[PDB]
Design an enzyme around this catalytic site. Structure first.
Site, PDB file in Angstrom:
ATOM      1  N   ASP A   1       0.727  -1.121  -0.188  1.00  0.00           N
ATOM      2  CA  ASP A   1      -0.042  -0.026  -0.099  1.00  0.00           C
ATOM      3  C   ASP A   1       0.850   1.383   0.136  1.00  0.00           C
ATOM      4  OD1 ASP A   1      -1.865   2.052   0.212  1.00  0.00           O
ATOM      5  OD2 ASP A   1      -2.361   1.553   2.272  1.00  0.00           O
TER       6      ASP A   1
ATOM      7  N   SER B   1      -0.914  15.611 -12.219  1.00  0.00           N
ATOM      8  CA  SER B   1      -0.939  15.215 -13.577  1.00  0.00           C
ATOM      9  C   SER B   1      -0.932  16.331 -14.480  1.00  0.00           C
ATOM     10  CB  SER B   1      -2.055  14.142 -13.805  1.00  0.00           C
ATOM     11  OG  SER B   1      -2.381  13.933 -15.274  1.00  0.00           O
TER      12      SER B   1
HETATM   13  C1  LIG Z   1      -8.367   3.145   1.677  1.00  0.00           C
HETATM   14  C2  LIG Z   1      -7.606   2.845   0.655  1.00  0.00           C
HETATM   15  N1  LIG Z   1      -6.696   1.709   1.099  1.00  0.00           N
HETATM   16  C3  LIG Z   1      -6.187   1.600   2.451  1.00  0.00           C
HETATM   17  C4  LIG Z   1      -7.096   0.504   3.000  1.00  0.00           C
HETATM   18  O1  LIG Z   1      -6.745  -0.627   2.254  1.00  0.00           O
HETATM   19  C5  LIG Z   1      -7.645  -1.852   2.290  1.00  0.00           C
HETATM   20  C6  LIG Z   1      -7.205  -2.976   1.479  1.00  0.00           C
HETATM   21  C7  LIG Z   1      -7.855  -4.091   1.691  1.00  0.00           C
HETATM   22  C8  LIG Z   1      -9.151  -4.210   2.558  1.00  0.00           C
HETATM   23 CL1  LIG Z   1      -9.908  -5.691   2.793  1.00  0.00          CL
HETATM   24  C9  LIG Z   1      -9.562  -2.948   3.058  1.00  0.00           C
HETATM   25  C10 LIG Z   1     -10.694  -2.702   4.082  1.00  0.00           C
HETATM   26  C11 LIG Z   1      -8.588  -1.741   2.995  1.00  0.00           C
END
Ligand SMILES: CCNCCOc1ccc(Cl)c(C)c1
Length: 330
Positions: A35, A199
């Site tokens: 992430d 962008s």
């Molecule tokens: C908000 C955008 N990314 C941060 C959170 O990322 C996720 C990834 C997987 C799952 Cl299951 C959830 C609930 C959140």
């Protein structure tokens, strides 16, 4: 040093990507969601409330001879989608694709929100934004990339996400066979802790390119492409029958449609997202209404170049003293 790991879609829609990560001694392999929009490495664990575990693989620190409790440290994170998790903290050895960090903060979940419990394929998250966003208290901890950076051959990592197919995260090197043409680099602001860039504009299908500055974040942990309401309206206006549905939560379109591509600017360069990448399938099983992959950021406070955009490119996260981002077609 370098590392290289395959990242795999969790489902047929590319709702997220998981990458195997080795934690502890002997290794415990968990499949984590890398992430670039957050900065905590947290895992389902033997300490997670049992009713909140449903099929995930857990980290058990008591079985790792290299795990050490980080005394007094806690963490708690709330993501922009409303999900959350919290717990305590160990340090342990963590390896990705052959690249090893000793003493990495591994945040062990005591509590996770329902969306995490309900996703059996994600065993935790590995944050790759800037360490200033890390939530560990009272002593903030560094991301895996920050800890590895000085040892890497080059202080970079790359994201090469696949469309309905596996892709690759590389650390420490740029695979020049993985993209076409050249990589266009663009400036990053770290002021909000994100890989934030501007962008240079967009086009819809074969339409003319609109030069306009769009500030947003490169976020591998967000599924969709979130852009200003003007841009998103211009996109969906080219799809017969598409509409914004307040009850569904965004733009929906007839599943029978053929979607146009969407182009975004990186400097003078152009990344083309094919129309098929923008189809996220029926809104509910068996429906002929499909969910759009380009959605308005109006209620978010920031534009987000999530997986829909990034999977159309080879993306360099350059963590040199002045960070930058690079985009190439592939
Ligand atoms: C908000 C955008 N990314 C941060 C959170 O990322 C996720 C990834 C997987 C799952 Cl299951 C959830 C609930 C959140």
């Amino acid at each position: 040093s370098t590392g290289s790991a395959t990242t795999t879609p969790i489902d047929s829609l590319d709702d997220a990507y998981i990458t195997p990560v080795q934690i502890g001694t002997p290794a415990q392999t968990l499949n984590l969601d890398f992430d670039t929009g957050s900065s905590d490495l947290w895992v389902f664990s033997s300490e997670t409330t049992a009713s909140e575990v449903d099929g995930q693989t857990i980290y058990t620190p008591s079985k790792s001879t290299t795990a050490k409790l980080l005394s007094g440290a806690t963490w708690s994170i709330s993501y922009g989608d409303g999900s959350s998790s919290s717990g305590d903290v160990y340090t342990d050895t963590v390896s990705v694709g052959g690249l090893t960090v000793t003493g990495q903060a591994v945040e062990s979940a005591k509590k996770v929100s329902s969306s995490f419990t309900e996703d059996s394929t994600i065993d935790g998250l590995l944050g790759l934004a800037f360490s200033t966003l890390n939530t560990v208290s009272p002593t903030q901890q560094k991301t895996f990339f920050d800890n590895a950076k000085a040892s890497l051959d080059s202080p970079v990592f790359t994201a090469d996400l696949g469309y309905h197919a596996p892709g690759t995260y590389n650390f420490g090197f740029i695979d020049t066979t993985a993209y076409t043409g050249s990589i266009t680099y663009t400036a990053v602001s770290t002021k909000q802790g994100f890989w934030e860039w501007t962008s240079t504009g967009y086009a819809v299908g074969s339409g003319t390119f609109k030069s306009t500055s769009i500030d947003g974040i490169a976020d591998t942990g967000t599924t969709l492409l979130y852009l200003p309401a003007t841009v998103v309206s211009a996109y969906w206006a080219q799809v017969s029958g598409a509409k914004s549905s307040s009850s569904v939560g965004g733009y929906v379109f007839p599943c029978s449609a053929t979607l146009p591509s969407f182009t975004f600017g990186v400097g003078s360069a152009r990344i083309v997202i094919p129309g098929d990448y923008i189809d996220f399938g029926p809104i509910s099983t068996g429906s002929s209404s499909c969910f759009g992959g380009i959605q308005s950021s109006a209620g978010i406070g920031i534009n987000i170049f999530g997986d829909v955009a990034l999977k159309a490119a080879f993306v360099v996260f350059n963590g040199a003293t002045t960070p930058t981002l690079g985009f190439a077609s592939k």
